[PDB]
Design a protein around this nucleic acid. Structure first.
Ligand SMILES: [K+]
Ligand SMILES: [Mg+2]
Ligand SMILES: [Mg+2]
Length: 50
RNA sequence: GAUCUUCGGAUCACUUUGGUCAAAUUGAAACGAUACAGAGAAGAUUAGCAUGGCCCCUGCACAAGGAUGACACUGCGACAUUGAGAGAAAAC
């Protein structure tokens, strides 16, 4: 019922592993797009408050 | 002017200007730095060769390099609808 605790750790890591997908370094491009969107939103908001 | 000629004249020669543009802030390029992230292949470290072109850089080069040079690598509707029921409406 409580099969110690390290197995919970490995189960959590396995669960994160099985559904991670999306490669490994594809996480850079989407983040860069999000940051560019944030910066352009800030620029536009600054223009409208001006 | 030189030559003859006979003091009438004839010979000899005959139209430049290489202009990225008028004495340098405002018409020959391409950027330093600081501040942000900050190094490809489904755990982790990592060899590379390619594909695409209004992306180039180094090179004498159709060698080869520049992170495998970099960017890109997805995704949807010439679907005909009927198959049926129900409440409505207009209709077997
Ligand atoms: K490499
Ligand atoms: Mg190469
Ligand atoms: Mg390449």
């Amino acid at each position: 019922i409580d099969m110690d605790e390290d197995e919970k750790e490995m189960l959590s890591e396995a669960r994160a592993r099985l559904a991670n997908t999306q490669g490994k370094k594809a996480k850079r491009k989407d983040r860069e797009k999000q940051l560019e969107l944030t910066r352009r939103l800030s620029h536009l908001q600054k223009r409208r408050e001006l």
